Structure 1
């Protein structure tokens, strides 16, 4: 089969020919229908040799949808042809977190060497993929696979981050979204669907501000040194109830701390190595909690799919072939994909 793999440290990913896998006991083979590109793939490929621990080669793609092609021995609850999304942050299935479906917060996965597809195990950017267990498949019914693939991370991750503090986001609340890319453009729409928060979007790029308004942001303002004052003008001095920072640069985290309300929240979702919130007296308002959330839970993925099926999420995508996978990664690096890049195999 054709796949896109990271094969050597510091190089671009390459299109390869590797064996179509066969599912072992408990596993499911999917024919992949769509595979999302995530900025996290750039972080992974930019790691120096000393830091990179995901193994080479690595089939990329941790945003996967497909149809069930073959059932491994003992697998029940799915039939051949069923359309499914892949739950990404595989856990042990047995710990207290995993028992609640919160496999993103599994305490045993690292020690057991359990890694996500595309991030240590073979990913979705290939004609076929293996999923370890039936509990890591969620049915999508007739959802368009191209718009469905991003739900698995671009949807799930902001959904989880918002869910952690949803009770704060009542009528009269304000939620700031920093970074209107793959994650952020979905984050805006989640906020509109599951809360009555006023949504203020922030981006460096005026076209992304336009995207923010297109997907339902109440206001969209330019990132950088003037953003905190501009946000405060809109919120009137109380500041923002919650800030969801999908950039996570020191500058955006600083903006977040300068606008967050008393008893509010900052969710540092975007990854920029070394950047951090400074949570201390006189550096942040009283009661304003800060967290770096990770991916999301099993039940959250089902809820994201339910939002998509109800017409609440307009996922902006651009489609690529497998052969164009490396080109698509170049596009993502330069910031020229308006929403999510999605590879559609054959």
Structure 2
């Protein structure tokens, strides 16, 4: 009754399939999906052994989502049919201390209740239609291009959160290091320019990507090679960086992060590369904080979208069809996407 992209066999690839069109239960909303982002966390999931995977088969993929409100469920009010909306992804219980703050990303009782985001447990966005649990997980778009902006629901939000979190320890005139100019990283760079006073240093591996980073306003773009630590030291007295945003998060990049963060600095480990930064005396410098943030707050999403409208940040997009989505995943794992892959069905 509708088409969708699903993960169905452990270790297998994602398939386009036919499945029922869902109806909105009470309190719920269904969207006609205008755009759908592909994130490298979607990759990480599909290469897990059968034992570590916990989202059930089948699973409709894709947790960056925008659309137009197709049908309203029982009792729902707040949004009309026809409204352009983005999906706030990191769903939570709505009532705990964090949720009440808007920070459903840090919900203290969601693992317990088995609340899961769309595309990471609940039916996701890579489909012609998707359901959203509740009205508070929708954010108005007005007249922002869904394709241009949908990726801000994660690729923007997540580093924005991490950056906004870091401005306490990142004074204007400071220096910030972004490791990885990928989907998040390339937005991370723009955001850092928009709202910190920092001198942004980007690091990636392909020159392709360094040029993009520099084009997106990075004051410096460097290879994350064995000379990277030295150059950053050079560029910052011998003081190091006030903030470091590791959007790779592997043991190598984390090691780099430790060796360059300044006294009293901060490291946001944003990417999931399987590493851990050993934080402590004579490991991390004095006053140096370390954190593995996760996604962002409800308000923070609205703030990122408001920045898009202002023209202070954008997603570099590479467009695909619903059918091309499996190919786009192969491109993403190959590392030959420029920015964000966005599927339009």
Q: Normalising by structure 1, report the TM-score.
A: 0.98
Shift of 1:314: 2.2
- 2 CA distance for matches of 1:12 and 1:224? 32
SS in 2 for 1:25: coil
The residue matched to 1:168 in structure 2 has which SS? coil
Deviations 1:74-130 (A, max 9, x none): 111111111111000000001010000100000111111100000000000000000
The corresponding residue for 2:269 is: 268
Deviation at 1:168, TM superposition (A): 2.3
Check whether the contact 2:180–2:202 (CA below 8 A) recurs between aligned residues: yes
- Determine if the alignment matches structure 1 residue 157 to structure 2 residue 158: yes
Q: Secondary structure at the match of 1:199?
A: strand
Aligned to 1:91: 92
Give unpaired runs (5+ residues) of structure 1.
none
Match of 2:70 in 1: 69
Shift of 1:170: 2.1
User: Which whole-Å CA distance do the structure 1 matches of 2:23 and 2:232 have between them?
Assistant: 53
Match of 2:277?
Answer: 277
Instruction: Map residues 118-197 of structure 1 onto 2, 5 A cutoff.
Output: 118-197=119-198
Q: Which runs of 5+ in 2 are unaligned?
A: none
Separation of aligned partners in 1, 2:95 and 2:224: 43
The whole-number CA distance in structure 2 between the counterparts of 1:2 and 1:231 is 49
Match of 1:308 in 2: 308
In the TM superposition, what whole-angstrom CA distance separates every residue of 1:291-342 from its partner, at most 9, and x where no partner exists?
0000111000000100111101121010110001100100001001000000
**How far did residue 236 of structure 1 move?**
1.8
Structure 2 counterpart SS, 1:160: helix
- Name the counterpart of 2:38: 37
How many residues in Structure 1 have an aligned counterpart in Structure 2? 344
Q: Residue 42 of structure 2 contacts residue 61 of structure 2 at CA under 8 Å; is this kept in 1?
A: yes
1:331 equivalent in alignment to 2:335: no
| Mapped partners of 1:226, 1:84: distance in 2 | 45
Conservation of the 8 A alpha-carbon contact between 1:215 and 1:314: no
2:93, 2:193 → 1: CA distance? 34
Q: Distance in 2 between matches of 1:194 and 1:79?
A: 34
Answer whether contact 2:149 2:314 (CA < 8 A) is retained. no
Any residues of structure 2 matched to 1:234-249 within 5 Å, and which? 234-249=235-250
CA shift digits 1:221-263 (9 cap, x unpaired): 1102111111111112111000000000111111111110000
Contact 1:242 1:265 in 2 (8 A): yes
Aligned to 1:309, the other structure's residue is in SS state helix
Q: Deviations over 1:19-70 (max 9, x none)?
A: 1101011100000000000000110001100000011100000000111111
Conserved 8 A contact 2:269-2:292:
yes
RMSD: 0.7
TM-score (norm 2): 0.99
Q: 1:109 maps to which residue?
A: 110
The aligned residue for residue 254 of structure 1 is 255
Q: What is the alpha-carbon distance in structure 2 between the residues aligned to residue 257 and residue 305 of structure 1? A: 32
